[PDB]
Amino acid sequence: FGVVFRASPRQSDVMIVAGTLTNKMAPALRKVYDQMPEPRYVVSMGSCANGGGYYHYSYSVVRGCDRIVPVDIYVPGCPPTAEALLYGILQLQRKIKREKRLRIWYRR
Amino acid sequence: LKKTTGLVGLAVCETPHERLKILYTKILDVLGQIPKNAAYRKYTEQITNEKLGMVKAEPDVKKLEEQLQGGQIEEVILQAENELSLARKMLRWKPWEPLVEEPPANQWKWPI
Amino acid sequence: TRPTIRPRNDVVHKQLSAFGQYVAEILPKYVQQVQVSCFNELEIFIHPDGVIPVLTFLRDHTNAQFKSLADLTAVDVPTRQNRFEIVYNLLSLRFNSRIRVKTYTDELTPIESSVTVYKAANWYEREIWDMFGVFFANHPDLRRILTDYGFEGHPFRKDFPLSGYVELRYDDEVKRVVAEPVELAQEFRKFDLNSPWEAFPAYRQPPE
Amino acid sequence: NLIEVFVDGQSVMVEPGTTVLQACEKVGMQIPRFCYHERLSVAGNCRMCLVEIEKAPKVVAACAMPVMKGWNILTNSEKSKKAREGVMEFLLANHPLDCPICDQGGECDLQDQSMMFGSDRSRFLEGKRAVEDKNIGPLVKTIMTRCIQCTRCIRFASEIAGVDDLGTTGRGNDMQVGTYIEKMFMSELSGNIIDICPVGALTSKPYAFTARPWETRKTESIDVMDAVGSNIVVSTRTGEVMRILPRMHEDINEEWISDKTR
Amino acid sequence: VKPIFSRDMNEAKRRVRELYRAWYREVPNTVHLFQLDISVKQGRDKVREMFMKNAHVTDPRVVDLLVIKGKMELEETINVWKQRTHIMRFFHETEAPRPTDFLSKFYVGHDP
Amino acid sequence: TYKFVNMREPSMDMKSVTDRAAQTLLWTELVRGLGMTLSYLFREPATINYPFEKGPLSPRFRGEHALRRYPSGEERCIACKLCEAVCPAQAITIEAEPRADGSRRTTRYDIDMTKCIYCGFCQEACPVDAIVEGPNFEFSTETHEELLYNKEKLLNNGDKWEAEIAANIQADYLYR
Amino acid sequence: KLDITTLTGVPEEHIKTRKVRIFVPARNNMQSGVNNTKKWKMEFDTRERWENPLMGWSSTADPLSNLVLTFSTKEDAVAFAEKNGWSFDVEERKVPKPKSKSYGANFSW
Amino acid sequence: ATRVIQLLRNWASGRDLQAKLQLRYQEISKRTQPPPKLPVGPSHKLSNNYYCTRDGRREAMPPSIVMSSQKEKKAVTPAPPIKRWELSKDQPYL
Amino acid sequence: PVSEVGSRVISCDGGGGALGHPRVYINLDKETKTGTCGYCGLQF
Amino acid sequence: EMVRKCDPHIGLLHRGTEKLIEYKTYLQALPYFDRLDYVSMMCNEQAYSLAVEKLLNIQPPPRAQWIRVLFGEITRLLNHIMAVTTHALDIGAMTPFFWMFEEREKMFEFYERVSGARMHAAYIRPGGVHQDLPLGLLDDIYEFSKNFSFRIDELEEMLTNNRIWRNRTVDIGVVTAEDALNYGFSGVMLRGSGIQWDLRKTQPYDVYDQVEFDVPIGSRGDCYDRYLCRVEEMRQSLRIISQCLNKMPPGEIKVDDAKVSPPKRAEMKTSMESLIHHFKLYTEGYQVPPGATYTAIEAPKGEFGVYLVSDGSSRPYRCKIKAPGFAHLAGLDKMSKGHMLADVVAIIGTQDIVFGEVDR
Numbered sequence A: 001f002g003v004v005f006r007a008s009p010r011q012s013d014v015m016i017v018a019g020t021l022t023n024k025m026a027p028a029l030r031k032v033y034d035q036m037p038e039p040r041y042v043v044s045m046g047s048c049a050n051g052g053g054y055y056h057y058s059y060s061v062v063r064g065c066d067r068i069v070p071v072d073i074y075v076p077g078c079p080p081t082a083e084a085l086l087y088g089i090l091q092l093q094r095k096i097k098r099e100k101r102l103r104i105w106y107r108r
Numbered sequence B: 001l002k003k004t005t006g007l008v009g010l011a012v013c014e015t016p017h018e019r020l021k022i023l024y025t026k027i028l029d030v031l032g033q034i035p036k037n038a039a040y041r042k043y044t045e046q047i048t049n050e051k052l053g054m055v056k057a058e059p060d061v062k063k064l065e066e067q068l069q070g071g072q073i074e075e076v077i078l079q080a081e082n083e084l085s086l087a088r089k090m091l092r093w094k095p096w097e098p099l100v101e102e103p104p105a106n107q108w109k110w111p112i
Numbered sequence C: 001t002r003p004t005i006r007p008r009n010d011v012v013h014k015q016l017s018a019f020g021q022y023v024a025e026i027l028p029k030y031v032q033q034v035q036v037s038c039f040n041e042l043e044i045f046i047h048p049d050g051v052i053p054v055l056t057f058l059r060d061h062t063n064a065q066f067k068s069l070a071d072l073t074a075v076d077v078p079t080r081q082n083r084f085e086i087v088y089n090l091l092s093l094r095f096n097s098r099i100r101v102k103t104y105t106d107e108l109t110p111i112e113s114s115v116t117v118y119k120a121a122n123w124y125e126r127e128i129w130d131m132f133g134v135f136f137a138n139h140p141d142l143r144r145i146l147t148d149y150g151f152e153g154h155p156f157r158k159d160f161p162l163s164g165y166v167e168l169r170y171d172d173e174v175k176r177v178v179a180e181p182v183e184l185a186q187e188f189r190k191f192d193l194n195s196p197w198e199a200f201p202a203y204r205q206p207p208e
Numbered sequence D: 001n002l003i004e005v006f007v008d009g010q011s012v013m014v015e016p017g018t019t020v021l022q023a024c025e026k027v028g029m030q031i032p033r034f035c036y037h038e039r040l041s042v043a044g045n046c047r048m049c050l051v052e053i054e055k056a057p058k059v060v061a062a063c064a065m066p067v068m069k070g071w072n073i074l075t076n077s078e079k080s081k082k083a084r085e086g087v088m089e090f091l092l093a094n095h096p097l098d099c100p101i102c103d104q105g106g107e108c109d110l111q112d113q114s115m116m117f118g119s120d121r122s123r124f125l126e127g128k129r130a131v132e133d134k135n136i137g138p139l140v141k142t143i144m145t146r147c148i149q150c151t152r153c154i155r156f157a158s159e160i161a162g163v164d165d166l167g168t169t170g171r172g173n174d175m176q177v178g179t180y181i182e183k184m185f186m187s188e189l190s191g192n193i194i195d196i197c198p199v200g201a202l203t204s205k206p207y208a209f210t211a212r213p214w215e216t217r218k219t220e221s222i223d224v225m226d227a228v229g230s231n232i233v234v235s236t237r238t239g240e241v242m243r244i245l246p247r248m249h250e251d252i253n254e255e256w257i258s259d260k261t262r
Numbered sequence E: 001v002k003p004i005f006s007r008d009m010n011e012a013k014r015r016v017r018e019l020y021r022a023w024y025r026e027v028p029n030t031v032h033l034f035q036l037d038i039s040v041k042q043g044r045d046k047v048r049e050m051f052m053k054n055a056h057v058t059d060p061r062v063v064d065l066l067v068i069k070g071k072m073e074l075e076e077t078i079n080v081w082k083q084r085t086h087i088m089r090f091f092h093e094t095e096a097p098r099p100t101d102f103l104s105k106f107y108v109g110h111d112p
Numbered sequence F: 001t002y003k004f005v006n007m008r009e010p011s012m013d014m015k016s017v018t019d020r021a022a023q024t025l026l027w028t029e030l031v032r033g034l035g036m037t038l039s040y041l042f043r044e045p046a047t048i049n050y051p052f053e054k055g056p057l058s059p060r061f062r063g064e065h066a067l068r069r070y071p072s073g074e075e076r077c078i079a080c081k082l083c084e085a086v087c088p089a090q091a092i093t094i095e096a097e098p099r100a101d102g103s104r105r106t107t108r109y110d111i112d113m114t115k116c117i118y119c120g121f122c123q124e125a126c127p128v129d130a131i132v133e134g135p136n137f138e139f140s141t142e143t144h145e146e147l148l149y150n151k152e153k154l155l156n157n158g159d160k161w162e163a164e165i166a167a168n169i170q171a172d173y174l175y176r
Numbered sequence G: 001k002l003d004i005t006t007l008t009g010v011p012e013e014h015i016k017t018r019k020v021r022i023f024v025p026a027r028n029n030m031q032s033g034v035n036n037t038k039k040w041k042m043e044f045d046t047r048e049r050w051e052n053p054l055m056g057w058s059s060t061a062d063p064l065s066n067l068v069l070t071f072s073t074k075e076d077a078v079a080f081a082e083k084n085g086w087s088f089d090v091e092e093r094k095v096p097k098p099k100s101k102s103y104g105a106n107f108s109w
Numbered sequence H: 001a002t003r004v005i006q007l008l009r010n011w012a013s014g015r016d017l018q019a020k021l022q023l024r025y026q027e028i029s030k031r032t033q034p035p036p037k038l039p040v041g042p043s044h045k046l047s048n049n050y051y052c053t054r055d056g057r058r059e060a061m062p063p064s065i066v067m068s069s070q071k072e073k074k075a076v077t078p079a080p081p082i083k084r085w086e087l088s089k090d091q092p093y094l
Numbered sequence I: 001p002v003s004e005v006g007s008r009v010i011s012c013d014g015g016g017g018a019l020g021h022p023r024v025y026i027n028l029d030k031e032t033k034t035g036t037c038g039y040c041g042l043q044f
Numbered sequence J: 001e002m003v004r005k006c007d008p009h010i011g012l013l014h015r016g017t018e019k020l021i022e023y024k025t026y027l028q029a030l031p032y033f034d035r036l037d038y039v040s041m042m043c044n045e046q047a048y049s050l051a052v053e054k055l056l057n058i059q060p061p062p063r064a065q066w067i068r069v070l071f072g073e074i075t076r077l078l079n080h081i082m083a084v085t086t087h088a089l090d091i092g093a094m095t096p097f098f099w100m101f102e103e104r105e106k107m108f109e110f111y112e113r114v115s116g117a118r119m120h121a122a123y124i125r126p127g128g129v130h131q132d133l134p135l136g137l138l139d140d141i142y143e144f145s146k147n148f149s150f151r152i153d154e155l156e157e158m159l160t161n162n163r164i165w166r167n168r169t170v171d172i173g174v175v176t177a178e179d180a181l182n183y184g185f186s187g188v189m190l191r192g193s194g195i196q197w198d199l200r201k202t203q204p205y206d207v208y209d210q211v212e213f214d215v216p217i218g219s220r221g222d223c224y225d226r227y228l229c230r231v232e233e234m235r236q237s238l239r240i241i242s243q244c245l246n247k248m249p250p251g252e253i254k255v256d257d258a259k260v261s262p263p264k265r266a267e268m269k270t271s272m273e274s275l276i277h278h279f280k281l282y283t284e285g286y287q288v289p290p291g292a293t294y295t296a297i298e299a300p301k302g303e304f305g306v307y308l309v310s311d312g313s314s315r316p317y318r319c320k321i322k323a324p325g326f327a328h329l330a331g332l333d334k335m336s337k338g339h340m341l342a343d344v345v346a347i348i349g350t351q352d353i354v355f356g357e358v359d360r
Ligand SMILES: CCCCCCCCCCCCCCCCC[C@@H](O)O[C@H](CO[C@H](O)CCCCCCCCCCCCCCC)COP(=O)(O)OCC[N+](C)(C)C
Pocket: F023, F024, F025, F026, F027, F030, F031, F034, J163, J164
C-alpha cells in the first residue's frame, strides 16, 4: 500500500499510537508529535489509547490518547486484528482524499 | 586432567585434596571458638567431619564427587569457602540467645 | 476424592517440616515460627532487625544454599501495630526447593537493605520504596521507579485511590501537558461482591 | 445456673434451655437456615438446619431442641453435610429457573445456601410444578412458584401485623401460602414482608427491575417521615436513591420499618 | 527504637537549611538550562513557600525523612530528569481560581 | 537430557585447516546464505489481496457487539444486568425499567468500545444469550463519540448481521 | 500522635474537609446471613457526583469515594486514622440481644 | 509453480523446497465440520455422587505449624540431592 | 405472536433448544399466560 | 562512543496492574496476565491457573493438562521466534523477520481458531481450560509442525554460520555462572553460563513428567550461546508437540466442580443448580480459601512467578507478579560496562526483555 515504517518523525508523517499510554511517557509523546512536519496526522489504536481501555482506572494511565494529541481515525480492538487496522488506514486514505485545501484557499 | 570446567565462572583446580584439607581445617579451627551452646557447631561439625573423613577416604576424584553427592566438587570447595566466611560471621553474631524479642501477637494472624 | 482434589504428598511435608525444625534449632535467636503451608511451602518468620543475619546464613551452606531471591514482595495490611509486611522467597538448586522468610515493619522504622545478602535485590529496594513508604538502610540508591516524576504519595498503600489524585492533560494556552485533579468521568463503579455465610469452617477465627 | 454444652469441641457455658441453633449462634458458627427467624417464631418446616448430635444417630432441627447436659454437636460432621445436601436438592427440585429475571437475584438466601452446601449437579429429571399469580395490592409483587413454604410470612402476619388475612392453603404439593379469595391485603406492616420474604416470591413492585444488589451503595442513617427515628440502610445506584431498607436497632425499629417511610 | 537520621529536632533543621542553600543556588541554573520563562525570582519564592508548607512538622524521624524526599527532587532537576512540564508543574498555573471564602464557595457548588 | 550446544570444536587436520582458511578467504557460508535468499525469491509471495481478498477467521472469533432478537421479532435482552457484573473493563452500563406490559427491559443499555477489551466474557455470561460478540471486526471510525454505542446502535448491528451471527452460533454452540 | 500528613502525598483538602466514618457494617436485611456483618470498616463520607452531559454517566469529582478498609478491632481503627491525622465518627458495635425461644410457648392455651 | 524454476530454486537452496513448500498451505483442513457430541465428564453419574467427597476447596486446611517460638541430633537436607542429568543420549553434541 | 393453546401447564424455552431462554413452565389454559422473555403466551 | 554506564529507567509503561487486580474478582483478573508478557500470552495464564489451583486444591482433568502444555509449547515457539528475530532486526538482519512472521501468523491462526482471538487468548482457566478445541484442529497442527523445521533450519543457515553475525555476538556479554545466580537470572540467561538448572525437568508441574526432551545447556555465556539455546529450545518444543499429539486422551476439559467451573450452556439452561452456580460464578465469583503462595513456571523468557494471597473473599488481596525480565534488566548494567554502544544494543536484545512485563 506504499506505507513504510521509517523512524524519526522528521522523515515521517502519520503516527500510530499502538498500545497503552502512561503518565511518565506522555510528555515525550507530545514532543514527538510537535516535531513532525505538517501535514502531520496520528492514529489511536486498539482499546489501548482510545481511552485507557482496560486500564481506564489507574493513576498512571492517561485515559485517551486524545488528551495529548489531536487524533484522526480510531481503530478499536484489543488488540485490533491487524487487518482491522488495515481497514483503518485505508479509511484514513479515504479521509485524506476528501481533504481539499486548494479548493478552499481559492474560495477564501 | 579435567578439560573445561563446566560453569563459566568456575575455574579448574587440579589436586583439590590439599586445598580441601586446608578447607576443613580452616573450618574446624574458625568454628573452634564456638561455645558448645548453639547447635550450629554440633551439626556443622557433624557433617564437616563426615565429609572430611571422606576426603581422607577418597584420594581419587572421579568417584569422590560420586561420594560427596554434589556435582563438581570443584564448586563445593567454594561452597565450603562460603562456610568459612559464614563462620567468620557466626561469632560476630555471637553464640545464640533463646530468641531476641517477640512480635506483638496481634499481628501474624492470617487471614487478617 | 481422587479425580479432582490434589493428592498432596506427605513426603515433602515431612522433609520441609523436619528441615524447618532443623533451622529452628540451628539459629533460634530470631525464628519466631516455622509454619509449613500444607501445600508444601515452608516459611519462617524474622524479627525486622534480624533480616541480614538470617538471609546471610540462608545463602551459607548447611543445606541453606538458597541462592537467588525470587522476589521481595511487600504485602500491606492497615491493621497491626506495624502495617507493612515484607516477604522474601528463596530457591536452593542442588536440593531444588523453595522457602520463604518474612518480617514486619513500621511505617517509619528504617529496616536495613538486604542487597548484599541475596545479591540481586538492588532493583527491589527501589521498587518497594516507591510503592510504599518503607525505607531500607544501607541501600546505595533508593529512588523512584514505576511512577511519574513528582507524583509523591506511594501507591499500593492499601488505602490511596487507584484513580490517584491527579491527571495530565495538554493545554494549548500554555502549550504544555500539565497536572490537574482527577475530574474522572463514569466513576469507578464499585461492586460489593462479598457475601454472607462463611464458606470455610475449616478456618474461621474464634468469635472472641 | 446455666448448663455447660460442647459446640463441636470447645466447652461453652450456655444459658439454660435455649435452642441448639442459639448455642452455635453463641459460639458464632452459623447453621444454614430458612424458616426459622428470631423476632418472629420457630417452626419445624424447611429442615435445612439439621445437625448431628455427638452420639445420637439421627440429626435434629437446630432451632428446635434446646441445649442441655453437656451436649456436644458436630456442625461440620459429614452426616450433617449429607443431610443438608439432601434437603437442598429437594428445595431446588421445583424453584423455577428465574435467577436472571427474579428481582431477588443478587442476594437471595436460597442462592447462597445453594452455593455453600448444595450439590452442584442436578439430578432431578422431570417436570417442575408452576402456579398462577395471586394479585395482592399496590405494593407487593407476588409471583409465587418461587415460593418455598417456609410459612414465615404468615408467621409474620398473624404475629406482628396482626392481620391474619393471608394463610396457607391446601395439602401436599399444590399447598400454597397465597391467601384464598381475591381480596387485597393492605396493612401498615405490609411493606416489611418484602424484606422478610426468603426468596423472590414476594418483592416490591415500585422498586422492581430498577436495580441489582451488587450495584447499589448502602448508606446508613435514620427515617424522617416519623419522629420515631428508626435506623435505616438507604441504597443508591450512584447519584440516585434506589431503595430503602430497615436497619436493625434494639431501641426502636429492631429490623422492622414502617411503610409510609419505605 | 531506631532513629532514621538525626537525633532530636534542630540537628535535622540544619539539614533542611543546607537543602535550601542547594535549591536556591541551583534555581537560576534551572531557569537557564530548562528555558523556563518563570520570573527568576518566582521559582525562589515558590521554593521558600514549599519550605513553608511543612513549616510546622515536629516529629523526630519524620523531618529527616522529609529531607530524604527532598533530596530526590533536586537530584532530578540536576540530572535533567523531569522536564519543563514536570518542573513547571508546581505552579498550578492552569487551575481555575478557588476562593476559600464561605459565601463565595457557597454560590458556586454543593461543596463538602 | 541436557545438551551441549557448541562445545564441539574444530579439527586441526590440515585438510580441514585449508578448508577453514579457504572458507575465510572465499566466503563460503556467506555465499550460502546469499544463495538462500536467492532461493526465497522464487517462492510464491504470501500476501493476500486485501480488501479484495480477506484473511481466514474462525467461528469463535470475537468482534463488534450486537444485541439480537428472537425469530418472533421480539428482543432477547432481559436486563439480568450481569453483563455489567462480569465485564472486567466494566464497559457496560445498564438501566432497566419495567415494560408497560410488565416484562423486564433495558432503557439505556450501552457500551463503549473505548473501554471494552473484547474479552468475550459478555458472550459467555448471558443466560438468554442476548448480547453476542459479532463476527464483524471492522468499524474503525472518525470520532470518539461514535465509539460509545447506544442500545439502538447495538440493535442495528444485530439487524445487519443476524443471519451471519446465527450462523456462527449454530456452528459453534455444541462446543460450548 | 504519629502524624504522617506530610509523608502522604494526599492534598490537604481531603485530610481536612472530610471525615472517616468507622463502623461495623449492618447485615443486609434481605439476607439471613451474618458473615459480612463482622469486622470494622472505615468508610469515608460521600461528596458530589453529578451526571455526564453525554450518555448520562455518573461523572464524579472526589478523589477517594470508593475507598474502604477492613479491621479486626475498633481501637486499632481509631488509632489508625489518628496516625493519618484523620477526623472520625466512631460508632458502636451493635450486636443483637440474645432472645428466648420456645416452640411450646406457642401452645400455652 | 513450474519445473523450469523449481529445479533452479531447489538447487539455489540446497534444501529442495518442493517436498514441503511450507511457505503456503495449498490444501489443509476443510472448514465445515461434523457436530461434536463431545465428552460427558467423570462425576456425571447420578447414582452415587456426594459433593461432601468430591469437594476440594473444603479440604483446604490451616497451615501446619512448628516451633511457634512466639508462644546426638543429626543433620538433615530439605530434600535428597537430585542426580546429575544424563547427557541427551541420541544427540550428545550440537 | 398469537397465543399457543394449553391445558394446562407446559414448557417454554423461546424455541431455541439450548439457544432460547432457559426452560420454564407456564401454567395456564383458557387464561392468558406467562411468560419469561418469550411472549409465547398460553391464552388458549 | 564507548558507554561508561547505562542507566535504565523503567516505569515508562507502568500501567499500574497490581493495584487494579485487587479490586476485581479472580476470574476477572485473568486477562491482565495476557496483558503482561504479551509475546508469551499463554504461559502467563497457565502460571496463574496453577497459582489458583494450588490454593483452591483442585486438579484439572488430564486432557486439559495436555492442552495446557501443548499451547504452552506453541507459545514457547512464539516467544523464541520473536526473540531471535527481533534481536536480529536490532542488528539489521532485517530478512529473517519476514521469513518467520509468516509462520507466527500461522500460529495465530490457531489461537484464532480455538480462542476466537488472534492473541491475548483468555482461554486457560483457573479451573482448567475454557471451551474445548474444535475437531478440525489437530491434523492442522500436524501438517504445520511437520514442515516448520525446514523453516527454522533455513533461518539457522542465515545466522549460525553467518560469521558476520558471529563476530557481532560471541564475546558479549558474558556473565559469571555464579554471578548469574546472585542476581537471580532465570531461564536461558542461566543456561548460557552452563548451569544445569531448569524448572520443567526440575520441579515439573504438568505432564512434563510424561514428555521427553533435551534441555540445551550453553557454555561461554556470550549472546551467541544464548541464541543457540533459543534455537535448540525451539527444536525441542517441536519435539514436545509430537508427543502431545500422540497421547491426547478423550475426556472432559473443565473440572467437574461446578462450584468453580461454570456449567456447560446446554445444561445451565435446563436445570436449577446449574443456572444458580452459573449465576454466582459470574456475579460474586468463587471464593478461595485464605492463604498465600508463590507458583513459578518455565515461561519462555525465564520462570514466571505469581505470589498471591487469598483473603478468603472472592477478590484476591495482593498479587505480586514476578517478572523474570525485571531481574535481567537489573543485571544489565553490570553485564554491559565498557562495551561499545552498538554492543549494548545487541545485549539488550540477548536479555530478550519485554518492558510490558518489567513495568507490570
Ligand atoms: C599467482 C598467485 C597470485 C594470487 C593467488 C592467490 C589469491 C589470494 C587469495 C584471495 C583472497 C581475496 C579475498 C578478499 C579478502 C577476503 C578477506 C575478508 O573476507 O576478510 C574477512 C571479513 O569478511 C568480509 O568482511 C566479508 C563481508 C563482505 C560482505 C559482502 C559479501 C560478498 C558476496 C560475494 C560477492 C562476490 C562477487 C564477485 C565474485 C567474482 C575477515 O576475516 P576474519 O576477521 O578472520 O573472520 C571473518 C571471516 N569471514 C570472511 C567469514 C567473514
